[PDB]
Symmetry: D4
Subunit: 62 residues, 8 copies
């Protein structure tokens, strides 16, 4: 069960055209290039997760 784990978490607005993820913090607006990140993993067994969560359509605010 012993193992070495290496993981990258990236949260932000995704633009696959320029292949970049950019998050709007409370101070700035950071931009990470998913391409470079992804490449660090090219050639190996990985576990990739892509989550997108939105709001629930309401039917009435009071």
């Amino acid at each position: 069960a012993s193992k070495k784990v290496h993981q990258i978490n990236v949260k932000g607005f995704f633009d696959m055209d320029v292949m970049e993820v950019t998050e709007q913090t409370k101070e700035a607006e950071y931009t990470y290039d998913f391409k470079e990140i992804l490449s660090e993993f090219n050639g190996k067994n990985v576990s990739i997760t892509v989550k997108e969560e939105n709001e629930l359509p309401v039917k009435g605010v009071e």
Copy 2:
């Protein structure tokens, strides 16, 4: 706190050149194209996780 979550989990051998992930099950060897999967999210806020876990270098076996 109510929300609608949509998530994709993909585990397998990653080849970013052809942009495909392929896992070796006990029964068959499935191949998913990360490109198509990724595109379903292009243009929205996301969390991407990319995990890669290996074994620990030993020094004694018996």
Copy 3:
């Protein structure tokens, strides 16, 4: 193990008569119709969870 997950979380005061869940936010009072939400899943395999948590009967506040 690769898969596509789609999940809906709804937290609020439940009224099964009108089939609606409504949560009280420190800014407003949203109302979601559990019927419409539930219907998005009609006809498929699902894990459903319904939690209700209350307070513990005390034997002395101070």
Copy 4:
């Protein structure tokens, strides 16, 4: 933080027309009526979760 939690987990094939969830066990096929279950919570604050997970579209099995 002390509290009393009461929760119901139901996993199966969902039919909202007859309002029943039915899971296929390697020993039998159980059927629960979501209506009765849901009613045990009518009139209270609740967190409800509805998950539906499917497979990932492949581009080549082998």
Copy 5:
């Protein structure tokens, strides 16, 4: 896997002599009697967890 779970969480200062647990909130000091709570479960299969966490002995402060 479908099931009905019923759980009690109780956090506070424990006195087994009078069999009572009492927590000091920011607003008030609640007192729950572990005896009554425990009895609700007498006669059934359970999981009991009892956790106690303290601070780590330091050796340098600045």
Copy 6:
């Protein structure tokens, strides 16, 4: 955030009269006396959890 945690997990059939918990393993049938266990914590802030999970009333096996 550094801390020392000490925790006890006890799963089995609960009998508060003789104050003992007894689990039926695959080999034997172990019996732990909740009294002794509980006492190790008498006099300190703790987080106690008592869970009891049962099966869901069915309406039809096929």
Copy 7:
């Protein structure tokens, strides 16, 4: 499944030369000696986790 767990969590700047971990709280600067802590476990089956998390190299701060 019943068991007694004993666990130590230590978060801070690690210096293996003097074998000490030191975290910078919003108040003080605590220093724990990993040596003493580690010794409390010498001679036992353990599980050890060492995590180090950094920031993601950006390409566009704004």
Copy 8:
């Protein structure tokens, strides 16, 4: 929230004298040297977790 995580998990019999952890798998007996592992983190903010879990003292085996 985006970040790079690097984590090591080590489970086995701990000997701090020789500074080695050794686990007994269902096949072999692997030995890892905690010293080398630990050094990979010397000089960094880390989180360290050391857990040791034992069995509960019974009062009636059967």
